[PDB]
């Protein structure tokens, strides 16, 4: 009866998918604002070995 | 003055048709599942879990950090004889008065 269950209760996937999409879009926005990733006068450090970004 | 239906009597008590109404609907099954949904996702999930999550939320407010810095500064300034709190927030030399 799985077809019946999914056919009439698929709406429960929209909102959790919405949360995942929100996380993805927020990470994309974070990508956009990477100008001063490590160029501050406070948290500016030399990249530790095997690191390319401080994710800031 | 108009042909209008008689005002409906006070909405039939959900207790009459199903004594264990729980409210939330007329059909008992949706009643039970609505109450289970409400009780679980509010009390069990949001109230309990979120209360713990807030309770153990990381001190990003830097309260402990502020206390540690205060302890270090107090120890150093008392050791060196410097006054505990300087009256000037910023160094006078850098400021150029008119």
């Amino acid at each position: 009866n799985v077809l019946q269950i999914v056919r009439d209760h698929w709406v429960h996937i929209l909102v959790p998918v919405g949360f995942v999409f929100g996380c993805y879009l927020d990470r994309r926005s974070d990508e956009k604002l990477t100008a001063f990733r490590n160029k501050s006068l406070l948290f500016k450090r030399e990249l530790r070995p095997n690191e390319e970004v401080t994710w800031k | 003055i108009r042909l209008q239906e008689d005002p409906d009597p006070e909405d039939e008590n959900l207790y009459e048709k199903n004594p264990d109404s729980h409210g939330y609907d007329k059909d008992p099954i949706v009643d039970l599942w609505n109450m289970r949904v409400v009780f679980f996702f509010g009390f069990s999930i949001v109230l309990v879990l979120g209360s713990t999550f807030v309770a153990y939320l990381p001190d990003y407010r830097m309260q402990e950090w502020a206390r540690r810095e205060a302890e270090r500064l107090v120890k150093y300034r008392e050791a060196n004889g410097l006054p505990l709190m300087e009256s000037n927030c910023f160094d006078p030399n850098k400021i150029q008065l008119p």
């Binding site: - | 850098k94 400021i95 150029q96 008119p98």
Partner: protein
Amino acid sequence: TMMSGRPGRVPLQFLPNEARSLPPPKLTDPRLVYMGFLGYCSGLIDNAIRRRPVVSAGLHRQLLYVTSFVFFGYYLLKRQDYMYALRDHDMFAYVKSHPEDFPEKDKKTYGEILEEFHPVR
């Protein structure tokens, strides 16, 4: 008024050849997605007005709505970006051409400046 009398403006031209120098609007632009959303809403409202099933009937009609809205919105966004770029270019050119009207100002540190204090008592 304003940009209407810009020299070299070919009348009744939606996108001048200069605009091609600007980046095209990305097909995933949020504005274009919003245009498609408007088209989808138009399809839903058409179905509701004609008393058709709101979300299922006329899938071809809804598709045409969305396609038309997105297609027009693409050129709309391209022209919008062109006009804003033209404004910026003209502004910078005028600023360069009239240095006196836009003089560089001496910068001072806050220590140098004096700003009066108003106590909140």
